[PDB]
Structure 1
Amino acid sequence: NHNAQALNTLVKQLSSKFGAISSVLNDILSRLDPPEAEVQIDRLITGRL
Protein backbone atom coordinates (compact mmCIF):
# COMPACT_ATOMS: atom_id res chain seq x y z
CA ASN A 1 0.00 0.00 0.00
CA HIS A 2 2.84 2.42 0.74
CA ASN A 3 4.45 1.80 -2.64
CA ALA A 4 1.13 2.10 -4.48
CA GLN A 5 0.23 5.28 -2.60
CA ALA A 6 3.61 6.80 -3.42
CA LEU A 7 3.09 6.09 -7.12
CA ASN A 8 -0.46 7.48 -7.03
CA THR A 9 0.74 10.66 -5.30
CA LEU A 10 3.48 11.03 -7.91
CA VAL A 11 0.83 10.75 -10.63
CA LYS A 12 -1.52 13.24 -8.97
CA GLN A 13 1.32 15.76 -8.66
CA LEU A 14 1.02 16.28 -12.43
CA SER A 15 -2.17 18.34 -12.02
CA SER A 16 -0.42 21.10 -10.04
CA LYS A 17 0.32 24.43 -11.70
CA PHE A 18 3.29 25.27 -9.42
CA GLY A 19 2.53 28.93 -10.07
CA ALA A 20 2.27 28.58 -13.84
CA ILE A 21 -0.81 29.62 -15.81
CA SER A 22 -1.75 25.99 -16.48
CA SER A 23 -0.66 22.49 -15.51
CA VAL A 24 -0.84 21.28 -19.14
CA LEU A 25 2.23 21.82 -21.32
CA ASN A 26 0.20 21.86 -24.53
CA ASP A 27 -2.02 24.68 -23.25
CA ILE A 28 1.05 26.71 -22.29
CA LEU A 29 2.61 26.13 -25.71
CA SER A 30 -0.60 27.03 -27.54
CA ARG A 31 -1.51 30.14 -25.54
CA LEU A 32 1.95 31.76 -25.36
CA ASP A 33 4.84 32.62 -27.63
CA PRO A 34 8.07 30.59 -27.19
CA PRO A 35 9.95 33.10 -24.98
CA GLU A 36 7.12 33.60 -22.47
CA ALA A 37 6.16 29.92 -22.68
CA GLU A 38 9.70 28.97 -21.65
CA VAL A 39 9.12 30.56 -18.24
CA GLN A 40 5.95 28.59 -17.54
CA ILE A 41 7.57 25.39 -18.80
CA ASP A 42 10.50 26.07 -16.47
CA ARG A 43 8.12 26.44 -13.53
CA LEU A 44 6.41 23.15 -14.38
CA ILE A 45 9.76 21.40 -14.89
CA THR A 46 11.01 22.58 -11.50
CA GLY A 47 7.84 21.46 -9.75
CA ARG A 48 7.77 18.02 -11.33
CA LEU A 49 11.50 17.54 -10.74
Structure 2
Amino acid sequence: NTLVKQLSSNFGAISSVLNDILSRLDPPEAEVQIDRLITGRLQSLQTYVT
Protein backbone atom coordinates (compact mmCIF):
# COMPACT_ATOMS: atom_id res chain seq x y z
CA ASN A 1 0.00 0.00 0.00
CA THR A 2 2.93 2.37 0.54
CA LEU A 3 4.10 1.67 -3.01
CA VAL A 4 0.62 2.52 -4.28
CA LYS A 5 0.48 5.75 -2.25
CA GLN A 6 3.90 6.99 -3.40
CA LEU A 7 2.53 7.57 -6.96
CA SER A 8 1.30 11.07 -6.00
CA SER A 9 4.79 12.58 -5.60
CA ASN A 10 5.90 15.22 -8.10
CA PHE A 11 9.66 14.67 -7.54
CA GLY A 12 10.17 18.26 -8.68
CA ALA A 13 7.97 18.12 -11.78
CA ILE A 14 5.00 20.31 -12.68
CA SER A 15 2.52 17.53 -11.85
CA SER A 16 2.49 13.87 -10.89
CA VAL A 17 -0.01 12.91 -13.63
CA LEU A 18 1.46 11.81 -16.95
CA ASN A 19 -1.72 12.57 -18.90
CA ASP A 20 -1.79 16.10 -17.48
CA ILE A 21 1.79 16.69 -18.64
CA LEU A 22 1.36 15.06 -22.08
CA SER A 23 -1.50 17.39 -22.85
CA ARG A 24 -0.52 21.08 -22.56
CA LEU A 25 3.15 20.28 -23.40
CA ASP A 26 4.97 19.25 -26.58
CA PRO A 27 7.42 16.30 -26.65
CA PRO A 28 10.69 18.26 -26.21
CA GLU A 29 9.38 20.03 -23.10
CA ALA A 30 7.36 17.07 -21.79
CA GLU A 31 10.43 14.82 -21.92
CA VAL A 32 12.21 16.49 -18.99
CA GLN A 33 9.17 16.26 -16.69
CA ILE A 34 8.54 12.63 -17.64
CA ASP A 35 12.22 11.90 -16.99
CA ARG A 36 11.99 13.33 -13.46
CA LEU A 37 8.94 11.18 -12.73
CA ILE A 38 10.65 8.07 -14.15
CA THR A 39 13.71 8.51 -11.93
CA GLY A 40 11.58 8.95 -8.82
CA ARG A 41 9.43 5.90 -9.44
CA LEU A 42 12.43 3.67 -10.18
CA GLN A 43 13.88 4.75 -6.84
CA SER A 44 10.65 3.78 -5.06
CA LEU A 45 10.73 0.30 -6.61
CA GLN A 46 14.40 -0.12 -5.67
CA THR A 47 13.74 0.73 -2.02
CA TYR A 48 10.85 -1.74 -1.88
CA VAL A 49 12.96 -4.58 -3.28
CA THR A 50 15.85 -3.93 -0.88
TM-score, length basis structure 1 = 0.80
1:31 CA displacement: 1.5
The 3-state SS of whatever aligns with 2:10 is: coil
Q: Which runs of 5+ in 2 are unaligned?
A: 42-50
**1:4-49 deviation line (CA, Å, top 9, x unaligned):** xxxx11001100000000000000000211001000000000000x
When the two chains are superposed, the root-mean-square deviation of aligned CA atoms in Å is: 0.5
Higher relative contact order (CA 8 A, sep 6+): 2
How many residues of Structure 1 are paired with residues of Structure 2 in the alignment?
Answer: 41
Q: Which runs of 5+ in 1 are unaligned?
A: 1-7
Query: In terms of Rg, which structure is larger?
Result: 1
TM-score, length basis structure 2 = 0.79
Give aligned-pair identity as a percent.
Answer: 98
Moved over 4 A (4+): none
